[PDB]
Structure formats: C-alpha cells, structure tokens
Amino acid sequence: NHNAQALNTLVKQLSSKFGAISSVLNDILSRLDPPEAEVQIDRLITGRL
Amino acid sequence: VNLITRTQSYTNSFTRGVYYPDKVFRSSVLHSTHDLFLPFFSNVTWFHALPFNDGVYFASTEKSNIIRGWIFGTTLDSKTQSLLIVNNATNVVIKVCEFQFCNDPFLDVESEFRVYSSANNCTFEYVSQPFLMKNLREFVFKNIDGYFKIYSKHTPINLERDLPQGFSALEPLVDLPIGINITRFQTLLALHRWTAGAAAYYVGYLQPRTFLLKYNENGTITDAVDCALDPLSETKCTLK
Amino acid sequence: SFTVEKGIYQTSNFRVQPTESIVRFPNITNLCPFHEVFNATTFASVYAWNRKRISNCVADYSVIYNFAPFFAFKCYGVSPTKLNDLCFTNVYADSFVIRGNEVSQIAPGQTGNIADYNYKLPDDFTGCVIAWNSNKLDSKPSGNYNYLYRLLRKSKLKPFERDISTEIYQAGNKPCNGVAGPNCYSPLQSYGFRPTYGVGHQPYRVVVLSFELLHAPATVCGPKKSTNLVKNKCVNFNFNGLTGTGVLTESNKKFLPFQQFGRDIADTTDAVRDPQTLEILDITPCSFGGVSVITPGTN
Ligand SMILES: *[C@@H]1O[C@H](CO)[C@@H](O)[C@H](O)[C@H]1NC(C)=O
Ligand SMILES: *[C@@H]1O[C@H](CO)[C@@H](O)[C@H](O)[C@H]1NC(C)=O
Ligand SMILES: *[C@@H]1O[C@H](CO)[C@@H](O)[C@H](O)[C@H]1NC(C)=O
Ligand SMILES: *[C@@H]1O[C@H](CO)[C@@H](O)[C@H](O)[C@H]1NC(C)=O
Ligand SMILES: *[C@@H]1O[C@H](CO)[C@@H](O)[C@H](O)[C@H]1NC(C)=O
C-alpha cells in the first residue's frame, strides 16, 4: 500500500503548474518563442526537483 | 388573453440533476469535480416571471405537448435581447431577437403575435431537430462565460406523483455562443383556438458544489456523492 | 576512472526514435472574415465598441501584414510569428478609434480615463493589439465630431464591459433634475479631428483580438495541410492541435457521441478520435528503458 501510494503521488504531481501558463512543455515550445519560455520552464523544473 | 393561473407547492428533489461536466472519456475511476449542481435532497418547487439565478433545473412529465420552448430575458422587453426557444413537430427554432413580448405569451396554434408584438435587430438564429421527443423529461440550463449550455435527459417512468429515486446522468444537448445576461425566464404554452387547460412542472436552482462521481468500466456515470451533505459524505469524499 | 572492477553498472538509457509525422487538421475551406473587420470605412466610438465573433473558419493572418504599416502590433500571450500554426476555440475582435497618445492605455493592468470608463482589459488577457494611424480617413478639415468618449462615471468598469447610458452626471449633492446646470456636466465628450493636428492627437484605428486556448474541440485553425494515417509504429501525431508521439492502435473503447479524448487514473491521454473519420484509436508510449554494462575487471 505504501509503495503504490508513493508512486501514485509522484506520478500525479506531474500535472501541477507551479505558477506557469501550462503544465505541458510541448505546447509551450510550440506556442511561445525561445527568449521567453525559460521563465515558465524554471518553475516546473523547481517543482519537479 | 389571460387564461392561466399558477399554484405553488414544494417537494423533495432526492438525488436528481447530475450531468456530464466535460467531453472527456473515463472508465472505472472516481473523479472529483467542483461545479454548479443541484444539491442532494434539495427543496424543489412544483407549479400547476421566475428568476434565473445561476442556472435552472426543469422537470416535466406531461405528454400533451402543452410545454414547448422557453423565454429568457432580463427585462423581457424589446429594448434588450431575449432568448426564445420554440419546439415544434418538425424542428426547433432558437432566436435572440429583441422581441416585444406580451404579459402572458401563449401560442395560438400558430400565430406568434400573441407571444411577441414584432421582431427586430438580432444576429443569432438556430434551427435543428426538436429538443422534445410515463415519460420524464429533465433539463438543465446555465449561462456562463458567454455560452448558454443546455443539458437534457428523457427517461421512462412508472405512475408516480413525485420525482423517482435513482441515478440518470444528463447528456449535453447544446452549447450556444450567445453571450448575454439572463435574469428571468418563462415557460411557453400552446392552447388550441381558446381553450384553457392546465400544466405542471418541477423547478430547482443550482449551486456551486463539489461532487464525487463514479465512472463504470463502460463509459457511463452510475453513482455520485455530495461532499457537503453530511459528515458521512464528507468522510467518503476525503477517503475517495 | 581508467580502471573498472568486476561488476554490473548502469550507464545510460535508450528510447525508440519516431518514424514520421501525422497531421489531421479538419478539412473546412472557409476563410475567416478578417478582411471585413478591417478597412470597414466605419469604426464605432470607444464608449460603444463593436464586438465580432469568429469561429468555424480557416484563419489566415497574411492579409494583416500587407494591410498597413502598424504603429503597434503587440501580442501578449502568444508569439506574433507563430499565429499561423496554433488552433483556437473562438476568436473575439473589437475595433474602434482613439486618440494617438492614449494607445498605451490599452494594455492589461493599466489606468486612465479610457481604461476605467471606456474599455477595460482583464489581467490574464491572451491575445493581440493592433493600432494604426487613420488621419487620412477620419479627420475632417473643419472637424469630425462623430467620435465621442465617456469622461465622468460613478465607478470603474469591469473587464470586457460596455456602457451606453447617456445621462447628465451629478458631481454634487443637489440633483441635476435633467438640466445641464452648474456642477452638472454631460457624460460624453466629442473628439476634434483635423488634418492640421500634430501627431498624438490624430485619430488611430485599434483592433483587439482575443483567443480562447485549451478549451472544447477547437474550430479556428488550418492554414496547414493534413496527412494520411499510420498505425503500429513510433510516429508523431497532431490531432487538431493535440501534439504527441507514440504508437496508434485500434481501440475497443465505447466512446459516447460527444466525447473527444480519453484519460486514465494517472490523468494522461490514452485515446483519441480522428476528425476526418470517426474512429477511436488508442495511444501507447514508445519503448524506452535503461542499459547496463556487465564486465569483469579490466585486468
Ligand atoms: C420546502 O420549502 C417550503 C417553503 O420554501 C417549506 O414550507 C417546506 O417545509 C420545505 N420542505 C419541504 C419538504 O417541502
Ligand atoms: C416547425 O418548425 C420548422 C422550423 O422553422 C418550420 O419549418 C415548420 O414549418 C414548422 N411547422 C409548422 C407546422 O409550423
Ligand atoms: C436595432 O439596433 C440597431 C443598432 O443600434 C438600430 O439601428 C435599430 O434601430 C434597432 N431596431 C431595429 C428595428 O433594427
Ligand atoms: C445584464 O443585466 C444585469 C442586471 O440588470 C446588468 O448588471 C448587466 O450589465 C447586464 N448585461 C450583461 C452583459 O450582463
Ligand atoms: C457495456 O457496454 C458493452 C458494450 O456495449 C455491453 O456489452 C454491456 O452490456 C454494457 N453494460 C451495461 C450497459 O451495463
């Protein structure tokens, strides 16, 4: 039970935005430009770490 | 031209008024959703200008086809737009023209002069298959973010004077991009001509609530839990 | 290190590479009425701004570039050079005429008479603002007074709110009783446009475009061209904006006639329907894993 709960929580944490426009990198890459995507990417990186 | 008198009564809603929130398929899962729903075991009105508030749950069981279409508007005047829905044998017509409605708009059966004096400026018109089709018809209307969402369901029912006990998800019918205010609504009636009959219906109001819905393996919702009804349901929602 | 002891070590990972790409945009061939919004020869006043709704058409932006050189072309939530590839749910267009120096007022989180009493934008606005000079069209030599703006109002304006009331504002305790007496002033002020006016007071035509991203199945896109459909291979796909990579297989899922996508316990996409041919397809991730190296000692 503990192992399954931990893995499920870790997987579910991937859908949080942490203060960005979206929680998916693929759309941000194909919707914005390079000089402004890093600001959104940094928050996701910090949260997932 | 006034031939209608309305009488009021009160009854219990039980667990009725559940609709699919989105267009996402799910199976064998329990999903939590915060949205406008009809609270469980609420206090619905039975009728034999009404405020719209944040959405309306309508229920009918008559087969005489007396009910057909509805009127939605803020001041119910030709100075502002007002949604008009008319259901008929072949099709359904939806308009947003600033009709000059009368005090008691009733169909003549089929001159619309009694319903409204004249038509005028408007942009949206819609024609489709009629919404209507021992039978209970339930409808949910809500206007939000410039969209008029209408959900409906038709179900066979035995001879019962009140709402039955069970579960029936309301599949979406239409989502019209109108974007106007709605404050009051009225029910349209069709009287043969000028006999005056009688009709009855159930009215309830929606509230923002958190629900726990159960999807079967097979594409349908079969159970729901209202998290704010009592401590037991709160515990159920907390434990998922 | 240059020496390795006996054992098994984890070095790196591998993933199967994609084969090709799949595009499944809808096949509607209408053209969105962007041309009608512009060069209409008549633009309403700022206090009563036109609002047009655009949906169910293929949107192209090439006409905008060749329309006219722009005083301002500022897009907030989208890069202006990528609008030819995205797909939106519904488009809103608002056009009017304003003074040259007040262009900066049109922006999220701004203040000013036009900002608070004429036209207010939301803080989370996601769209574009276009402003270009129209001194040669809406500037009478004697003066054009058809363009009016509200000046006095009791309270601010909510985002995307329009007021058309025309009553004598009361700035004092005594009532105006319907006359333009002392302390009582008209709510609307008429602009004065002449060709002799310097830059900063000449009229400017402004068009604001608002999008709706990540919503119900989108309709406003399609400058690109669709492709065929392949299955049982590591391929890239783009279904009406939903982009990804994986393996597409036949699905035994009973989709209701109004659902479009599918999700699981982990809340990730695992099924989709083809817009051109109504058919449910399952999506599976391509193979990936780790690599271990087994070796005795280097000696
Ligand atoms: C419902 O409301 C009415 C008045 O609003 C009240 O008289 C009645 O007791 C309530 N409960 C039921 C079960 O009708
Ligand atoms: C029913 O409504 C449709 C839709 O406008 C209309 O074409 C048809 O004539 C109507 N039928 C009658 C009997 O009026
Ligand atoms: C409808 O609205 C337009 C726009 O304001 C107005 O010109 C017209 O007089 C109104 N009435 C009719 C019958 O068109
Ligand atoms: C609708 O009516 C309400 C109340 O009368 C009013 O506050 C609002 O400005 C009107 N218009 C819209 C678009 O809501
Ligand atoms: C679920 O759907 C399948 C396929 O349509 C069917 O075999 C089964 O009877 C359904 N179960 C229900 C409706 O409870």
Short mmCIF file of C-alpha atoms in Angstrom, two decimals, chain C residues 5-137:
data_model
loop_
_atom_site.label_atom_id
_atom_site.label_comp_id
_atom_site.label_asym_id
_atom_site.label_seq_id
_atom_site.Cartn_x
_atom_site.Cartn_y
_atom_site.Cartn_z
CA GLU C 5 36.37 -3.54 -11.33
CA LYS C 6 34.24 -6.63 -11.88
CA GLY C 7 30.52 -5.94 -11.67
CA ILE C 8 27.47 -4.54 -13.43
CA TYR C 9 26.98 -0.79 -13.85
CA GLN C 10 24.12 1.39 -15.08
CA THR C 11 25.44 3.78 -17.73
CA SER C 12 22.63 5.39 -19.75
CA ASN C 13 19.13 4.97 -21.17
CA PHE C 14 17.65 4.31 -24.60
CA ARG C 15 14.39 5.23 -26.32
CA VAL C 16 12.92 4.21 -29.67
CA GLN C 17 13.02 7.10 -32.12
CA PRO C 18 9.94 8.28 -34.05
CA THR C 19 9.46 7.30 -37.69
CA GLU C 20 7.36 10.04 -39.33
CA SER C 21 4.71 12.68 -38.61
CA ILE C 22 0.91 12.69 -38.87
CA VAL C 23 -1.29 15.76 -39.37
CA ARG C 24 -5.10 15.52 -39.09
CA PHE C 25 -6.44 19.06 -39.31
CA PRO C 26 -10.10 19.46 -40.33
CA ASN C 27 -10.98 19.88 -44.00
CA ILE C 28 -13.10 23.04 -43.89
CA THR C 29 -12.04 25.55 -46.55
CA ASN C 30 -13.80 28.74 -45.47
CA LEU C 31 -11.85 31.96 -44.94
CA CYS C 32 -12.31 33.86 -41.70
CA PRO C 33 -13.74 37.39 -42.23
CA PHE C 34 -10.63 39.24 -41.06
CA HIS C 35 -10.81 41.43 -44.17
CA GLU C 36 -14.31 42.58 -43.20
CA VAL C 37 -13.19 43.62 -39.70
CA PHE C 38 -10.53 45.91 -41.20
CA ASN C 39 -11.00 48.63 -43.86
CA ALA C 40 -14.70 48.81 -42.99
CA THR C 41 -14.66 52.62 -43.56
CA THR C 42 -16.72 53.00 -40.35
CA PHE C 43 -15.42 52.44 -36.82
CA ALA C 44 -17.63 52.95 -33.78
CA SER C 45 -16.81 55.23 -30.86
CA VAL C 46 -14.70 53.98 -27.97
CA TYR C 47 -17.58 54.22 -25.47
CA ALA C 48 -19.61 51.82 -27.68
CA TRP C 49 -17.17 49.38 -29.25
CA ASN C 50 -18.12 46.75 -31.82
CA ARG C 51 -17.63 43.10 -30.87
CA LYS C 52 -17.43 40.45 -33.60
CA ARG C 53 -17.23 36.69 -33.05
CA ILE C 54 -15.16 34.48 -35.37
CA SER C 55 -15.48 30.69 -35.44
CA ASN C 56 -15.82 27.77 -37.87
CA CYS C 57 -13.36 29.00 -40.49
CA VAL C 58 -9.72 28.71 -41.53
CA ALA C 59 -7.87 31.71 -40.10
CA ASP C 60 -5.08 33.33 -42.12
CA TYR C 61 -3.03 36.32 -40.98
CA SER C 62 -1.09 37.14 -44.16
CA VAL C 63 -3.58 39.89 -45.08
CA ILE C 64 -2.80 41.72 -41.83
CA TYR C 65 0.88 42.18 -42.71
CA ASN C 66 0.10 43.70 -46.11
CA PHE C 67 -2.80 45.77 -44.72
CA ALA C 68 -0.77 48.75 -43.49
CA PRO C 69 2.40 49.61 -41.56
CA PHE C 70 1.48 49.43 -37.90
CA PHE C 71 2.02 51.88 -35.08
CA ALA C 72 1.67 48.93 -32.71
CA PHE C 73 1.42 45.15 -33.15
CA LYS C 74 1.73 43.73 -29.63
CA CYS C 75 0.81 40.14 -28.74
CA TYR C 76 0.85 39.22 -25.05
CA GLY C 77 0.19 35.51 -24.57
CA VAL C 78 1.36 34.30 -28.00
CA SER C 79 4.42 34.95 -30.14
CA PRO C 80 3.28 37.02 -33.15
CA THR C 81 5.34 34.92 -35.60
CA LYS C 82 3.64 31.61 -34.70
CA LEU C 83 -0.06 32.50 -35.11
CA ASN C 84 -0.14 30.56 -38.39
CA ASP C 85 0.17 27.19 -36.62
CA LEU C 86 -1.94 27.33 -33.44
CA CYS C 87 -5.60 26.36 -33.09
CA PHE C 88 -8.09 28.36 -31.03
CA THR C 89 -11.62 27.72 -29.80
CA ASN C 90 -13.24 31.10 -30.51
CA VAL C 91 -11.94 34.48 -31.68
CA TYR C 92 -13.17 37.89 -30.50
CA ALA C 93 -12.47 41.08 -32.46
CA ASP C 94 -13.09 44.58 -31.08
CA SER C 95 -12.46 47.64 -33.26
CA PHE C 96 -12.71 51.36 -32.54
CA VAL C 97 -10.98 54.75 -32.93
CA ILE C 98 -8.98 56.52 -30.22
CA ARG C 99 -6.52 59.38 -29.82
CA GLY C 100 -2.88 58.81 -30.68
CA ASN C 101 -1.37 59.47 -27.25
CA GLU C 102 -3.85 57.15 -25.48
CA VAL C 103 -2.72 53.97 -27.28
CA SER C 104 -0.57 52.98 -24.29
CA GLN C 105 -3.70 52.91 -22.11
CA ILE C 106 -4.87 49.78 -23.97
CA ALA C 107 -2.94 47.11 -22.03
CA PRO C 108 -3.64 44.74 -19.11
CA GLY C 109 -3.30 46.32 -15.68
CA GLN C 110 -3.45 49.93 -16.86
CA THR C 111 -5.12 53.12 -15.66
CA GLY C 112 -6.68 56.10 -17.39
CA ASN C 113 -10.00 57.59 -18.41
CA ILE C 114 -10.35 55.24 -21.38
CA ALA C 115 -9.04 52.36 -19.25
CA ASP C 116 -11.54 52.75 -16.40
CA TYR C 117 -14.59 54.35 -18.05
CA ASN C 118 -14.48 53.20 -21.70
CA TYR C 119 -12.73 49.84 -22.20
CA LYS C 120 -11.11 47.62 -19.55
CA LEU C 121 -8.96 44.53 -20.26
CA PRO C 122 -8.58 41.53 -17.93
CA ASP C 123 -5.30 40.82 -16.18
CA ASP C 124 -4.98 37.35 -17.77
CA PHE C 125 -5.57 38.64 -21.31
CA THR C 126 -4.29 36.32 -24.06
CA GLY C 127 -4.39 37.95 -27.48
CA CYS C 128 -3.09 40.76 -29.67
CA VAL C 129 -3.50 44.53 -30.01
CA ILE C 130 -3.11 46.31 -33.35
CA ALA C 131 -3.09 50.09 -33.71
CA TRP C 132 -2.55 52.04 -36.93
CA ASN C 133 -2.94 55.67 -37.97
CA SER C 134 -6.10 56.75 -39.81
CA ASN C 135 -5.56 60.51 -40.03
CA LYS C 136 -6.22 60.48 -43.80
CA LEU C 137 -9.69 58.93 -43.36
#
